[PDB]
Amino acid sequence: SASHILIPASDLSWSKQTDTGITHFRAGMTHEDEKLIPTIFRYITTWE
Amino acid sequence: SYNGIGLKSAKGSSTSGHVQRSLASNN
Amino acid sequence: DEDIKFQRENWEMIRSHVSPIISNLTMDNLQESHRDLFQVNILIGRNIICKNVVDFTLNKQNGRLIPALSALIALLNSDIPDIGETLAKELMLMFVQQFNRKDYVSCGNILQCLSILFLYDVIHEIVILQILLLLLEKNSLRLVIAVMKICGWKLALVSKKTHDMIWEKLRYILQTQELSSTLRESLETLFEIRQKDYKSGSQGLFILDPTSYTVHTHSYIVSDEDEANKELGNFEKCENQIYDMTSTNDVEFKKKIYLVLKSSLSGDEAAHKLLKLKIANNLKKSVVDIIIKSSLQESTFSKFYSILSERMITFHRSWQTAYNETFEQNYTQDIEDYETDQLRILGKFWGHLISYEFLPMDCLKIIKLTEEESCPQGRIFIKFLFQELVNELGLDELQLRLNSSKLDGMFPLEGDAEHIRYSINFFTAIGLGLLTEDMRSRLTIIQ
């Protein structure tokens, strides 16, 4: 899984201007029955 | 309300288009 | 005579029991005052218990304590109807006397009592309305406002039809007739409380249930001669579980925080999902533990758990206390279990929050560097702590924060040169020795 993730949405008119930061979350994938499926990014240790 | 945040439509998005405010970012 | 003697101090002590109970009568003491009052003979001191209520009402120090007093009267009238029977009588006569005396101070003291007694179903609405008819027959308008502000909430519920007719004649006063000024703004204030629906005249001690109070709604009127029974207050002469050894509630909750943690991409995303849960304040110490333990499963520090914890702290102060309680709980207790690969995660973790002021420098005052009160793994945790302090801030900015920290744990100055020799030896082993220039000046003076 990679898309059961709240995607950050923040103000596309002003997001081209500056870095707004994460102010709202767009839903990534839905279902009638809620399941918090884990995503690999957690399971892969970071480059730095 | 649609305050400039979100999608033009959820049709081709393949999502629901559900937008909720980040409780983390306040101050 | 010893029987006239023994009945007199019996009459004295009953008089000397009720009067300190009434003076100690307040809210959250009402049931305790009524319990001790019940064991003293109420029926023999029938006018004693009534007169100690009337005078404590009348004294003008009270007026505040009237709803505590009238709630005791309902407790008596539920227990003995005759007590609330006679006490409803005297307050009728106390009004009719002082209304004829035009004692406006003493009238309002009685009318606040008669209002809250009507709030507690002690007296009928007939005895209330006829007082209103006598007051509205004259002006008497300072008195009738304090009545209807308090009792009109209940009174419109019970007897709305005549109570509309009281309002309609009372409205005819302001609009078609001239009034004195200071009285006038108080009368229209009653019309202002009317549209606010009497929500500021409807607070009292409803201790009795409507079926626990035996309904002795005494239907006396203020046009009856009420026998004025003062005489019984004188002295006379009687010739008469499965134990919970498992924590499966916690394990399911511990699973849910871990699933939240692993389902997110960014640190702000998981911070959103935890704050969405609205976790109760008893568990918010435990949620911090689940974050930190799962930060040790990662086998490497991640900036995820920092920016997770930073959005917790800036949200609400009870999160900020929960990390401050956890940082003490980790250092004083949990260091003995943690391997050295987990200490480099935690020392980089807590060093991130301290260097960006999410935790203050004053939390570092708990940590003390001695030979006795230090763990060998505790010295490892401090070493990985200060490197993240050095790397983020720099060596000079760290020097300023440690000088404003005024701590004694890392920095012994007052004496005990074996600890000063210890602390210089430990910091130079880390690689930071520029900050130890204070101690070397202190050490050679001791030599």
Distance between CA atoms of residues C433 and C97, nearest Å: 91
- CA distance to partner chain A, nearest, from residue B2 (Å): 10
Question: Measured at the alpha carbon of residue A43, what is the angle toward residues A42 and A45, in degrees to the nearest 5?
Answer: 85
Solved using: cryo-EM
> What is C390-447 written as a DSSP string?
HHHH-HHHHHHHHHTT--SSS---SS-HHHHHHHHHHHHHHT--GGGHHHHHHHHHH-
Does C271 reach chain B within 8 Å, measured CB to CB?
Answer: yes
Chain C residues within 8 angstroms (CB to CB) of chain A: 259-266, 268-269, 272-273, 298-300, 302-303
Contact C271 B24 (CB under 8 A): yes
- CA distance to partner chain A, nearest, from residue C167 (Å): 55
- A26: helix, strand or coil: strand
How many contacts (CB atoms, under 8 Å) link A and B? 50
- C4: helix, strand or coil: helix
- Which residue among B15, B16, B22 sits closest to A24, beta carbon to beta carbon? B22
Using an 8 Å CB-CB cutoff, list chain A residues near B24. Answer: 22
Report the half-sphere exposure of C380 (CA within 13 A, side-chain side): 15
Determine which of C260, C264, C275, C304 to mutate to test the interface with B (most B C-beta atoms within 10 Å): C275
Determine which of A30, A31, A35, A36 to mutate to test the interface with C (most C C-beta atoms within 10 Å): A36
Contact B16 A23 (CB under 8 A): no
Does A20 reach chain C within 8 Å, measured CB to CB?
Answer: no
- Which residue among B6, B19, B22 sits closest to A22, beta carbon to beta carbon? B22
Closest CA to C33 of C64, C76, C91: C76
In a 10 Å sphere around its CB, with 0-12 CB exposed, 13-18 middle and 19+ buried, how is residue C345 labelled? Answer: buried
How many contacts (CB atoms, under 8 Å) link B and C? 20
Contact B20 C271 (CB under 8 A): no
Residue linked to tokens 């009348």: C58
Contact C275 B23 (CB under 8 A): yes
Residue linked to tokens 């709604």: C217
Using an 8 Å CB-CB cutoff, list chain A residues near B20. Answer: 6, 24-25, 27
- A22: helix, strand or coil: coil
Crossing angle between the packed helical segments C267-277 and C248-262, to the nearest 10 degrees: 150
Distance between CA atoms of residues C388 and C401, nearest Å: 14
Using an 8 Å CB-CB cutoff, list chain A residues near C345. Answer: none
Does A6 reach chain C within 8 Å, measured CB to CB?
Answer: yes
> What is C331-384 written as a DSSP string?
HHHGGGT--HHHHHHHHHHHHHHHHTTSS-GGGGGS----STT--HHHHHHHHH
Q: To what resolution in angstroms was this structure determined?
A: 3.6
Are residues C284 and C319 in contact, defined by beta-carbon separation less than 8 angstroms? yes
Give all chains having 3 or more CB-to-CB distances under 8 Å with chain A. Answer: B, C
Closest CA to B24 of C275, C292, C280: C275
Contact A23 B19 (CB under 8 A): no
C162 phi and psi angles, rounded to 5 deg:
-70, -25
Are residues A20 and A4 in contact, defined by beta-carbon separation less than 8 angstroms? no
C441 phi and psi angles, rounded to 5 deg:
-65, -40
Are residues C423 and C436 in contact, defined by beta-carbon separation less than 8 angstroms? yes
Contact A22 C268 (CB under 8 A): yes
Fold of C2-233: 1.25.40
> What is C298-317 written as a DSSP string?
TSS--HHHHHHHHHHHTT-H
Are residues C151 and C128 in contact, defined by beta-carbon separation less than 8 angstroms? yes
Q: C-alpha distances in angstroms, B12 versus A13, B1, B17, B20?
A: 20, 21, 10, 20
Using an 8 Å CB-CB cutoff, list chain A residues near C298. Answer: 45
Are residues C222 and C96 in contact, defined by beta-carbon separation less than 8 angstroms? yes
Determine which of B18, B20, B25 to mutate to test the interface with C (most C C-beta atoms within 10 Å): B25
